From a paper:
AARSs catalyze the formation of AA-tRNA in two steps within the same active site.
We mimic the motif alteration by the exchange of the first and third motif positions in PmIleRS2 that naturally carries the canonical HVGH motif. The insights into why IleRS2, but not IleRS1, can tolerate the non-canonical signature motif came from the crystal structures of the pair of PmIleRS1 and PmIleRS2, both in complex with Ile-AMS. The coordinates for the latter were taken from the mut-GVHH-PmIleRS2:Ile-AMS structure.
Numbering used by the authors: 1 to 1032
Write the structure that this text describes.
C-alpha cells in the first residue's frame, strides 16, 4: 500500500484515480469480465446537445451510474453506450439566436445547408461539454463510441422503423386541426403540448347574432376565443335541448331555456319554447362581414353543445377547433381560414391584417360594441397551451400533417405499461397512465430543416406513397443515381426523386422532418443500427431492464420509447422505470432559465469532489419528489462522510507501515468486544444496504452506510487508537489491524457504486485490485451479533446523556467526577461488560446501576393557585410557604399517601387535597440528572479538592506530553522534567506523583521555584513553566 501523507485535494485524488481508470481500461474491463454472466440491460437517455450541463443533470447520471455499477458488482454484465440527442426544435432555436435570425424565411435566406452546418457545429461543442462533465462525475458510459441521432446509421434505422410502421397503414397524412406554434411555425405533438400549459386570463364574450328574415330577433352566440369571430361559419345548438325566444326591451333574443335567467338580466319575458332541431337551418348575420362564406352562416346541430355554460348557441370557426371542423364538414359548409402560418390575420380581415390573433382580443371587443352586436364579456382563468421551446402561446390550427396512428394500438400501450414496474409506483397509473388513457394520434411532421427527414415519397401523378426503409431501398426506386454516401438530411434527400411503381410518375419526398422525440424513442433499435447490423447484440440488449430519467419524460422519452416500440414491435421496450424528481434552486426549477437557476457542476466537482456531490444527491433526500439542492449539503457530505473515510483510511495506512502489519502474514488475533461490535455493524450494514439497493432505495442505503461510517470513526477508531499507537505487535494490536483492514476493504466495496473515486482509492491501495472489478460484498451472518449491537447502542445513549449533563453544568470531561448512577427500568443490558467504557468516556470514578431513583431524588412541594387559590382564601400564601417549609420525608410521604395537612403559624392545621399541591422531583444535593425516558443518568457534580487536584494532575500530564511532541523527542527516552508553578499545582503534582510517573517516561521530575529559559504553558487558568533536560 502507498501513503496518504502528502496533502491531496479532492480534485487531485479524483484526477489521479481517473487516470488510473484510463490506463487500466477499468470501465471496459468491468464489462468484459462479466461476459457469460446474466445480462442487465440499461438504456442511456440521450441528453440534448443544446446547452451546458447543470447540477440538476447530475442527479440522473449519478443514479444511472449507481445502478450500473451495483448491478455489475452483483454478477451482471451491464453494457453502457452513451447517446446524444442532436435534432429538432431544441437545437434549431438555439442556433437561430446565435445567428441573429428567426423564422423559416430567414433560414432559407441564410441557406438550409449552411444553417444545418451551424447546427452540427453547435451540438458538437455541447457534446464535449457534456462528455467532460460526465467523466468527472464518474458516470461510466461509453462516450468514445456513442450513438448520435444525426449519424447516418442511426437515421437509417429510424427510417426502417418508420417504413415498417407505414407498411402497417399506421403512418398517414391528414388535414386536421392540431396544436400549432405560430412562432416555430409548425404543428406539435400531444406530449409536447402537455409540457407547456400555463394559467392565462382572457375574455369569453356573448355576441348578438341577428336573425335574417326577421326583425329585432338576435341569436345569443358564445365563444371563448373572440379572435375567431371573423371566421364564423355556423352556430351550433343541441337538437334535443330547449331554447326560448325571450323579449328584452326592444329586442328578442334566442337562448337556451336553462341559461336564460343567467344570460338575460334585469328584465325579460319568455315568449315561446323551441327545441334545437327546430332552430336548425335558421340564418343570421356575422358579427364581422370581412370574409365571405359561400355555404354557411346558419344554425346546425352538434351533440357536444352543453347547457351548463355559455348560451346553448356556440360560434363555430372550422379552422380553429376540432369540433368546429367536424361539424362544418358534416353539413357541407365552406372551410375558411383568415390566419397565416405566423399566427397573423390575412388580408381577408383588413383592420387587423398582419397582427397576431391573440393580441387582437382587446380591439375585437371594441369592434363588437361599435357594430351593435356585443352582449356580454367575462373573465376566464384557465390553462392554455404554450410552446414548450419558445414559450409562445399555441393555436389550434387546421393544417396538413403526418401522424403515427398510436390510437390503433392503444390497448397494446396499456398492456405494455401494465408490465412496467414504476418508481415511484404512482406514476404508472398517474402521470404516465392518465396520458395513455387520453391518447390521440402522434403528430410527427415538423415544417423545419434540422432533423430526421420523414422518409415518405408521394407520386405527383397518383399520390401513391413509398417509404424507403434503407439507403438501398432509396437507391432502388430513385429515378437518378443515388450515391452510397448520401446523407440522410435535408436538403440532400430533397434532391432524390423516385419513379412511381404504379404510374411511373415523379415521386417527391414530403418536405417535413420528424418530431425530435421520435429520434430518441427509436434508440433501442437505432443505437445498434438494427436490423442492418448487430442483430444478435440487439436481441441481447432488448428490452431494457431499467431506465432512469426525470419525470418530464412521462411526456417525453418514456412515452416516445413506449410508442415507437409498441408500433414497431408491439413489445414494451423497458421493464422498469425510475422517474426522477427535478432539482430546485431554493425555489425554482433548475434549467437553462433566464435566471439560470443551475450551478456549474464542474466547479462543484472541483471544489468538493464528485463523490461528495454524488453522496449529497443520493443521501440528502429521495429522488422521486422535487429536490431543493444546496452547495452546503455537498460541503457537509465532503466533511462528514468523504473526509471521514479518508482520515480513517489514512490512519490505517500510516500506522500499518510504522508497525509493519501485513494482511498476508498470519498473526495471533485477540479480537476485543469493540472489534466484534464494529464487525457486526459492518455486516448488518452490508445486509441492509443490499436490501435497499435491490429495491432501488439509494437514499436509505446511503443513510445506513453513513451511520456505520460515523460509528466507525467516532467510536471504533477513536476508542482503539491506543492499540494502533502501542509499541508491540501483540494479539490485541493485530486484532485491531485485522478488524480495520476488513472494515476498509468491505466498506469501500459497499461504497463503490455510490462514491466510485474514494472507494477505488482505498480498495486499490489496500488490495492491489480495482474495487469496480470486484464483487459486491456478502453479509457474513456469523459475524452479526444482534445482542452486542443492542447493548452498545444503549451504552452510546448513556454516554450521550452523561455528556449532556457535563455540558449543562460546565463540567469539562477532563475533570473527573465521583460517580454516575444509571436508573434502568428493566435489567435488559449486561451493564457490567461496559462499565470500563462508561467510566472512561464520562470520566467517573464509579458507575452504579439502580432499579429506581429513590436514593437519588427528593421532593419539594408548592401550591396550585389555579386549583386551591379560592379554597384557602387569604391563607393561600401562608399555605404555599408552609408546603415549601416541609422536610424531605414530608414531601416523599405526600407523593405516597396523596393526602397532606399543613400547620400554619397560627397553629391552625389545614388539609391539602392531592390536586392542591404541585409536586416537583429534584435530584439529591450535588447531583444532576438527564433522562431520555428509557435510561435516567444521575451525575455527581460535587467537586472535592482531591478531584480538582487529580484534574490538575491530568492537565499537567497532557501539557508535558504535548511539549514532548513539540521538541521532536524520541518516543522512548526518559527525560528530566523541570516544572514551575504555584502551590496549587505543586500540591497536585506531589499528591499524584505516581499517576504522573505512570503516564510520563520521566527519569526525574523537579519542582523548581523559577526556571531559566523555560517554556510557559497553560494548565487550566494557571501558567506552568516546563523544561526538559535530556538525561546523560
Ligand atoms: C431522456 C432525454 C430526452 C430524450 C431529451 N434529450 C432530454 O430531455 N434531454 S435533457 O438533456 O434536457 N435532459 C437530461 C436529463 O435530465 C433530466 N432533467 C431535466 N431537467 C431536470 C431538472 N431540473 N432536475 C432534474 N433532472 C432534470 C431530464 O429529465 C433527463 O433525464
Ligand atoms: Zn414555438
Ligand atoms: Zn404514381
Amino acid at each position: 500500500m502507498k501513503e496518504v501523507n502528502v496533502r491531496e485535494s479532492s480534485q487531485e485524488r479524483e484526477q489521479r484515480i481517473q487516470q488510473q481508470w484510463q490506463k487500466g481500461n477499468v470501465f471496459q474491463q468491468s464489462v468484459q469480465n462479466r461476459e457469460g454472466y446474466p445480462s442487465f440491460v440499461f438504456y442511456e437517455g440521450p441528453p440534448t446537445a443544446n446547452g451546458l450541463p447543470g447540477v440538476h443533470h447530475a442527479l440522473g447520471r449519478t443514479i444511472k451510474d449507481v445502478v450500473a455499477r451495483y448491478k455489475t458488482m452483483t454478477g451482471h454484465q451491464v453494457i453502457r453506450k452513451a447517446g446524444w440527442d442532436t435534432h429538432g426544435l431544441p437545437v434549431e432555436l438555439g442556433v437561430e439566436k446565435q445567428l441573429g435570425i428567426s423564422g423559416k424565411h430567414d433560414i432559407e435566406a441564410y441557406g438550409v445547408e449552411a444553417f444545418i452546418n451551424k447546427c452540427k457545429e453547435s451540438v458538437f461543442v455541447y457534446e464535449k461539454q457534456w462528455r467532460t462533465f460526465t467523466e468527472q462525475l464518474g458516470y461510466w458510459v461509453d462516450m468514445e463510441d456513442p450513438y448520435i441521432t444525426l449519424e447516418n446509421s442511426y437515421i437509417e434505422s429510424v427510417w426502417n422503423v418508420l417504413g415498417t410502421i407505414h407498411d402497417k397503414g399506421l403512418l398517414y397524412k391528414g388535414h386536421r386541426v392540431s396544436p400549432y406554434c405560430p412562432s416555430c411555425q409548425t404543428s406539435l405533438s400531444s406530449h409536447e403540448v402537455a409540457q407547456g400549459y400555463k394559467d392565462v386570463k382572457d375574455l369569453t364574450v356573448t355576441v348578438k347574432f341577428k336573425v335574417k328574415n326577421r326583425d329585432n330577433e338576435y341569436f345569443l352566440g358564445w365563444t371563448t376565443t373572440p379572435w375567431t369571430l371573423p371566421s364564423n361559419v355556423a352556430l351550433a345548438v343541441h337538437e334535443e335541448m330547449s331554447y326560448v325566444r325571450a323579449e328584452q326591451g326592444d329586442s328578442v333574443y334566442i337562448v337556451a331555456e336553462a341559461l336564460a335567467d343567467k344570460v338575460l338580466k334585469g328584465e325579460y319575458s319568455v315568449l315561446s319554447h323551441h327545441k334545437g332541431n327546430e332552430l336548425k337551418g335558421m340564418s343570421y348575420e356575422p358579427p364581422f362581414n370581412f370574409v365571405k362564406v359561400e355555404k354557411g352562416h346558419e344554425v346546425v346541430t352538434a351533440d357536444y353543445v352543453t347547457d351548463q355554460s355559455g348560451t346553448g348557441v356556440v360560434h363555430l370557426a372550422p379552422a380553429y377547433g376540432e369540433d368546429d371542423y367536424r361539424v362544418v364538414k358534416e353539413n357541407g359548409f365552406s372551410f375558411v381560414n383568415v390566419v397565416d402560418e405566423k399566427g397573423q390575420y390575412t388580408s381577408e380581415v383588413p383592420p387587423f391584417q398582419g397582427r397576431f390573433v391573440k393580441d387582437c382580443d382587446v380591439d375585437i371587443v371594441r369592434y363588437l360594441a361599435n357594430q351593435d352586436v356585443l352582449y356580454h364579456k367575462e373573465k376566464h382563468e384557465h390553462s392554455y397551451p404554450f410552446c414548450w421551446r419558445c414559450d409562445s402561446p399555441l393555436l389550434y390550427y387546421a393544417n396538413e400533417s403526418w401522424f403515427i396512428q398510436t390510437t390503433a394500438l392503444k390497448e397494446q400501450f396499456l398492456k405494455n405499461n401494465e408490465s412496467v414496474k414504476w418508481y415511484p409506483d404512482h406514476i404508472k397509473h398517474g402521470r404516465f397512465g392518465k396520458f395513455l388513457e387520453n391518447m390521440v394520434d402522434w403528430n410527427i411532421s415538423r415544417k423545419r430543416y434540422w432533423g430526421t427527414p420523414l422518409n415518405v415519397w408521394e407520386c405527383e401523378g397518383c399520390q401513391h406513397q413509398v417509404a424507403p426503409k434503407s439507403i438501398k431501398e432509396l437507391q432502388k426506386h430513385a429515378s437518378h443515381y443515388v450515391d452510397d454516401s448520401i446523407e440522410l438530411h435535408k436538403p440532400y434527400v430533397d434532391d432524390v426523386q423516385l419513379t412511381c411503381p404504379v404510374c411511373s410518375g415523379e415521386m417527391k419526398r414530403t418536405p417535413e422532418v420528424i418530431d425530435v422525440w421520435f429520434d430518441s424513442g427509436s434508440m433501442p433499435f437505432a443505437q445498434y443500427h438494427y436490423p442492418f447490423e448487430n442483430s444478435e447484440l440487439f436481441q441481447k440488449q432488448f428490452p431494457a431492464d431499467v431506465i432512469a430519467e426525470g419525470i418530464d419524460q412521462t411526456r417525453g422519452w418514456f412515452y416516445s420509447l413506449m410508442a415507437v416500440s409498441t408500433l414497431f414491435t408491439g413489445k414494451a421496450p423497458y421493464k422498469r422505470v425510475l422517474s426522477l424528481g427535478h432539482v430546485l434552486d431554493e425555489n425554482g426549477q433548475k434549467m437553462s432559465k433566464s435566471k439560470g437557476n443551475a450551478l456549474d457542476p464542474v466547479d462543484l466537482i472541483h471544489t468538493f469532489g464528485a463523490d461528495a456531490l454524488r453522496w449529497a444527491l443520493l443521501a440528502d433526500s429521495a429522488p422521486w419528489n422535487p429536490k431543493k439542492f444546496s452547495e452546503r449539503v455537498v460541503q457537509e457530505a465532503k466533511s462528514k462522510v468523504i473526509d471521514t473515510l479518508v482520515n480513517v483510511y489514512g490512519f490505517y495506512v500510516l500506522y500499518a507501515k510504522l508497525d509493519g502489519y501485513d494482511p498476508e502474514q498470519t498473526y495471533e488475533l485477540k479480537k476485543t468486544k469493540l472489534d466484534e461490535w464494529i464487525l457486526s455493524r459492518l455486516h448488518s450494514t452490508v445486509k441492509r444496504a443490499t436490501v435497499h439497493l435491490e429495491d432501488y432505495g439509494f437514499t436509505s442505503a446511503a443513510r445506513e452506510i453513513a451511520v456505520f461510517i460515523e460509528e466507525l470513526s467516532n467510536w471504533y477508531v477513536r476508542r482503539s487508537r491506543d492499540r494502533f499507537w502501542s509499541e508491540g505487535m501483540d494479539g490485541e494490536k493485530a486484532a485491531a489491524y485485522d478488524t480495520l483492514h476488513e472494515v476498509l476493504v468491505t466498506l469501500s466495496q459497499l461504497l463503490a457504486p455510490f462514491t466510485p473515486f474514494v472507494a477505488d482509492d482505498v480498495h486499490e491501495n489496500l488490495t492491489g485490485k480495482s474495487v469496480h472489478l470486484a464483487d459486491y460484498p456478502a453479509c457474513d451472518q456469523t459475524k452479526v451479533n444482534e445482542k452486542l449491537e443492542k447493548e452498545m447502542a444503549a451504552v452510546l445513549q448513556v454516554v450521550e446523556l452523561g455528556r449532556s449533563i457535563r455540558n449543562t453544568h460546565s463540567l469539562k470531561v477532563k475533570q473527573p467526577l465521583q460517580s454516575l448512577s444509571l436508573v434502568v427500568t428493566e435489567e435488559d443490558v449486561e451493564w457490567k461488560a461496559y462499565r470500563d467504557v462508561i467510566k472512561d468516556e464520562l470520566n467517573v470514578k464509579n458507575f452504579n446501576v439502580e432499579q429506581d431513583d429513590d436514593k437519588l431524588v427528593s421532593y419539594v412541594l408548592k401550591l396550585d393557585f389555579k386549583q386551591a387559590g379560592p379554597k384557602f382564601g387569604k391563607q393561600v400564601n401562608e399555605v404555599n410557604q408552609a408546603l415549601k417549609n416541609l422536610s424531605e420525608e414530608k414531601g416523599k410521604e405526600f407523593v405516597e399517601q396523596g393526602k397532606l395537612s399543613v400547620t400554619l403559624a397560627s397553629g391552625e392545621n389545614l388539609t391539602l387535597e392531592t390536586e392542591d399541591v404541585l409536586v416537583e422531583k429534584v435530584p439529591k444535593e450535588g447531583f444532576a440528572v438527564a433522562s431520555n425516558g428509557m435510561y435516567t443518568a444521575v451525575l455527581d457534580t460535587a467537586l472535592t479538592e482531591e478531584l480538582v487536584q487529580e484534574g490538575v494532575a491530568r492537565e499537567v500530564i497532557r501539557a508535558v506530553q504535548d511539549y514532548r511532541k513539540k521538541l521532536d523527542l524520541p518516543v522512548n527516552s526518559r527525560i528530566n522534567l523541570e516544572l514551575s508553578g504555584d502551590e496549587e499545582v505543586q500540591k497536585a503534582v506531589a499528591k499524584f506523583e505516581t499517576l504522573l510517573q505512570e503516564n510520563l517516561l520521566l527519569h526525574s521530575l523537579s519542582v523548581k521555584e523559577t526556571i531559566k529559559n523555560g517554556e510557559t504553558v497553560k494548565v487550566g487558568t494557571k501558567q506552568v513553566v516546563l523544561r526538559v533536560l535530556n538525561q546523560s
